[PDB]
Amino acid sequence: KVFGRCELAAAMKRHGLDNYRGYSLGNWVCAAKFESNFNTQATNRNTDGSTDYGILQINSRWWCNDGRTPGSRNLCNIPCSALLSSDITASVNCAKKIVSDGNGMNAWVAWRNRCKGTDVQAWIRGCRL
Ligand SMILES: [Cl-]
Ligand SMILES: [Cl-]
Ligand SMILES: [Cl-]
Ligand SMILES: [Cl-]
Ligand SMILES: [Cl-]
Ligand SMILES: [Cl-]
Ligand SMILES: [Cl-]
Ligand code: NA
C-alpha cells in the first residue's frame, strides 16, 4: 500500500506513535517518507546480506526473520514479510522496540540525515488529526 502523508500520520497516531519515547508524529512521518516513500512493500538489500522491510525499512540483521540472514536475531519475533502488510501494526510495534533500544530514532539513517533538526511538524501540517 502507498499511503498518503496525512493518511499515514492518522494511522501512526491511532497506533500510539505520536510522542512515543518523546518523538513527535512529524518525526515518524518524515522517517517513513525518506525510508520507503510511504510504500509498505519497500525492500532493500544491504551489503552484509541483510534486508530492510516496509514503511520504516526495519532490518533482518536484528529485528525480524527472513530465513536468509545468517547469525541474525529476530528481536520483534515476526517474519519480515509481516512488515510489508497494508496494516502497519507489525511495523509500528517493532519500531517501538527499536526506538527504545538506546539510540532513539538515530537507528534510522534517513531520519538522522534528512529529518533530525528540521521542521518535522511540516510533515503533519494541514492534516485532520
Ligand atoms: Cl509527501
Ligand atoms: Cl511534529
Ligand atoms: Cl535468518
Ligand atoms: Cl532472536
Ligand atoms: Cl518467522
Ligand atoms: Cl494500518
Ligand atoms: Cl531519544
Ligand atoms: Na533475522
UniProtKB/Swiss-Prot annotation:
In the egg white and polymorphonuclear leukocytes. It catalyses: Hydrolysis of (1->4)-beta-linkages between N-acetylmuramic acid and N-acetyl-D-glucosamine residues in a peptidoglycan and between N-acetyl-D-glucosamine residues in chitodextrins. GO terms for biological process: cell wall macromolecule catabolic process; defense response to bacterium; defense response to Gram-negative bacterium; defense response to Gram-positive bacterium; killing of cells of another organism. GO terms for cellular component: cytoplasm; endoplasmic reticulum; extracellular space. Substrate binds at residue 101. Keywords: Allergen, Antimicrobial, Bacteriolytic enzyme, Disulfide bond, Glycosidase, Hydrolase, Secreted, Signal. The keyword Nucleotide-binding does not apply. Residues 1-129 form the C-type lysozyme domain. Disulfide bonds join 6-127, 30-115, 64-80, 76-94. Its EC number is 3.2.1.17. PANTHER family: LYSOZYME C (PTHR11407:SF28). Lysozymes have primarily a bacteriolytic function; those in tissues and body fluids are associated with the monocyte-macrophage system and enhance the activity of immunoagents. Has bacteriolytic activity against M.luteus. This is Lysozyme C.
